[PDB]
Amino acid sequence: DQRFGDLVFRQLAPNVWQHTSYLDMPGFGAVASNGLIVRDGGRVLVVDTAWTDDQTAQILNWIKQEINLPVALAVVTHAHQDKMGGMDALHAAGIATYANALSNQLAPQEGMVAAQHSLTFAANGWVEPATAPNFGPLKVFYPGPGHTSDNITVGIDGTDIAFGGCLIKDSKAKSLGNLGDADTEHYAASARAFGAAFPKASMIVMSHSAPDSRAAITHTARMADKL
Numbered sequence: 001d002q003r004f005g006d007l008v009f010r011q012l013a014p015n016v017w018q019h020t021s022y023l024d025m026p027g028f029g030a031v032a033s034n035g036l037i038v039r040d041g042g043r044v045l046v047v048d049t050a051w052t053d054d055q056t057a058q059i060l061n062w063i064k065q066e067i068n069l070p071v072a073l074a075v076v077t078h079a080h081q082d083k084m085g086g087m088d089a090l091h092a093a094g095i096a097t098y099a100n101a102l103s104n105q106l107a108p109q110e111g112m113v114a115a116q117h118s119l120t121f122a123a124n125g126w127v128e129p130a131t132a133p134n135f136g137p138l139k140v141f142y143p144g145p146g147h148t149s150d151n152i153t154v155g156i157d158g159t160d161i162a163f164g165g166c167l168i169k170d171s172k173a174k175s176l177g178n179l180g181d182a183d184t185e186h187y188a189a190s191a192r193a194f195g196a197a198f199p200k201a202s203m204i205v206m207s208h209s210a211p212d213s214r215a216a217i218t219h220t221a222r223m224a225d226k227l
C-alpha cells in the first residue's frame with residue numbers, strides 16, 4: 001500500500017487502482033472506505049467517492065499526479081455518506097456523476113447531493129445501455145435489496161475484477177455491517193445475484209475490506225442466509 005496524505009492507494013491491476021478513505025470517528029477510530037480507479041485509454045473512470053469532498057479532491061489530485069488523465073465520469077454504488085461523500089467535489093471539478101435512479105431520489109433524504117445522471121435498470125438487474133453512455137469497461141448491475149434498496153454493483157470488463165460495494169463482505173467477516181436500511185429478506189438473494197452476474201471475477205473488491213476472492217460472495221450469502 002502507498003500512503004498519500006490522508007489516504008492510502010494500492011494497485012490491483014496495470015490499469016486498476018484502489019483508494020482508501022478514512023473517516024475519523026471519536027470513540028471508534030478510523031473507518032476505511034475503498035474505491036476503484038480504472039484507466040480507459042486516455043480517460044479515467046472512478047467508482048464511488050470518499051467520505052468527504054475534501055478527501056475526494058485528494059483522489060483527483062492523485063489521479064492528476066500519477067495518471068495525469070482527465071476523469072470522464074464517476075459512478076457511485078448507493079446514496080450513502082460512505083460512498084457519496086464527495087459529490088460536490090466531483091461537480092466542482094466538472095465530472096459527470098452517474099447514480100442509480102433510486103439513489104438520486106433517496107440522496108436528498110439521506111442528506112446527500114444526487115448525481116447529475118440517473119441509471120435505469122432492467123428486470124434482470126442489468127443496467128440499461130441507454131442511461132449508460134460511454135461507460136466502457138464499467139458494467140453496472142443491480143443485484144436487488146441488500147445493504148440498501150438502491151445499492152448497485154460494478155464489474156470491470158476486460159478484467160476478472162468486480163466491485164461489491166458495501167453489499168458484499170469479505171470471507172473473513174463476522175458481521176454484514178450496517179443493516180439499518182438493509183433488506184433482511186433479499187440480502188442473500190441479492191448477494192448471490194452479483195456472483196451469478198460476474199462469475200469470472202476472481203477479485204472481489206469492496207468498500208470496507210481489502211480485495212477478496214469469490215469466497216467473499218459465498219460468505220456474505222451464507223451470513224445473510226441467517227436473516
Ligand SMILES: O=c1c(O)c(-c2ccc(O)c(O)c2)oc2cc(O)cc(O)c12
Pocket residue numbers: 028031080081082166178180208
Ligand atoms: O459504511 C458504514 C459504516 O462503516 C459505518 C460505521 C461502521 C462501523 C461503526 O462502528 C460505525 O459506528 C459506523 O457508518 C455507516 C453509516 C451509515 O448510515 C451507512 C454506512 O454504510 C456506514
Ligand SMILES: [Zn+2]
Pocket residue numbers: 078079080081082147148166
Ligand atoms: Zn451504504
